[PDB]
């Protein structure tokens, strides 16, 4: 019994951080419930790692999550900071709301992609047990 | 320019929060 979700993520300029949260009945895990923080870059590492694992040949590895694109929204919010004095106050609020909804739309799609990939892994009978996958799930030494 | 995402508690709608950077 492995259940995985991403409750929250942060988009911050340089990177995107995903909180990957796990509930398990598996004994092999030290704890039943935990969370660790993973970058997109990490999921790709896992996927890369799985794909090249020899035992797992003749298994189909779930597709990796696509890289998050916050660029459009990011540029606008960077400008918006730019316009705080100058802009009519109302415009700024509407502009703030719209930019946020835009960031939000991206998050939803991207969170799903990353979440689905992990959930797809947990579902798999063989893959669910992979060591590299386990560390990704639980190694929370910051 | 850092944006924080919270998944909605079911069936709670999802959110984004500005952060300070």
Author numbering:
A (entry chain A): 30 to 171
B (entry chain B): 112 to 132
What does the paper say about this structure?
From the initial stages of invasion until eventual bacterial egress the chlamydial inclusion is extensively modified by insertion of numerous Type-III secreted bacterial effector proteins called inclusion membrane proteins or ‘Incs’. Specifically it was shown that the C. trachomatis IncE/CT116 protein could recruit SNX proteins containing bin-amphiphysin-Rvs (BAR) domains SNX1, SNX2, SNX5 and SNX6. SNX recruitment to the inclusion occurs via the C-terminal region of IncE interacting with the phox-homology (PX) domains of SNX5 or SNX6. In this study, we present the first reported crystal structure of a chlamydial inclusion protein (IncE) binding to its host effector protein (SNX5).
When bound to SNX5, IncE adopts an elongated β-hairpin structure, with key hydrophobic residues docked into a complementary binding groove encompassing a helix-turn-helix structural extension that is unique to SNX5, SNX6, and the brain-specific homologue SNX32. Confirming that the fusion does not alter complex formation, the short linker region is disordered, and the mode of IncE-binding to SNX5 is identical in all three structures. The IncE sequence forms a long β-hairpin structure that binds within a complementary groove at the base of the extended α-helical insertion of the SNX5 PX domain and adjacent to the β-sheet sub-domain. The β-hairpin structure of IncE (N-terminal βA and C-terminal βB strands) is directly incorporated as a β-sheet augmentation of the β1, β2 and β3 strands of SNX5. The N-terminal βA strand of the IncE sequence (Gly111-Lys118) forms the primary interface with SNX5, making main-chain hydrogen bonds with the β1 strand of the SNX5 PX domain for the stable positioning of the IncE structure. The two anti-parallel β-strands of IncE are connected by a short loop (Gly119-Ala124) that makes no direct contact with the SNX5 protein, and the C-terminal IncE βB strand (Asp125-Val130) forms an interface with the extended α-helical region of the SNX5 PX domain.Video 2. A major contribution comes from IncE Phe116, with π-stacking occurring with the Phe136 side-chain and hydrophobic docking with Val140 of SNX5. The reciprocal mutations in IncE residues F116A and V127D also abolished binding to the SNX5 PX domain, and the SNX6 and SNX32 PX domains, demonstrating the importance of these hydrophobic and π-stacking interactions for stable complex formation. In essence the IncE β-hairpin acts as a tether between the core PX fold and extended α-helical hairpin, pulling the two sub-structures closer together.
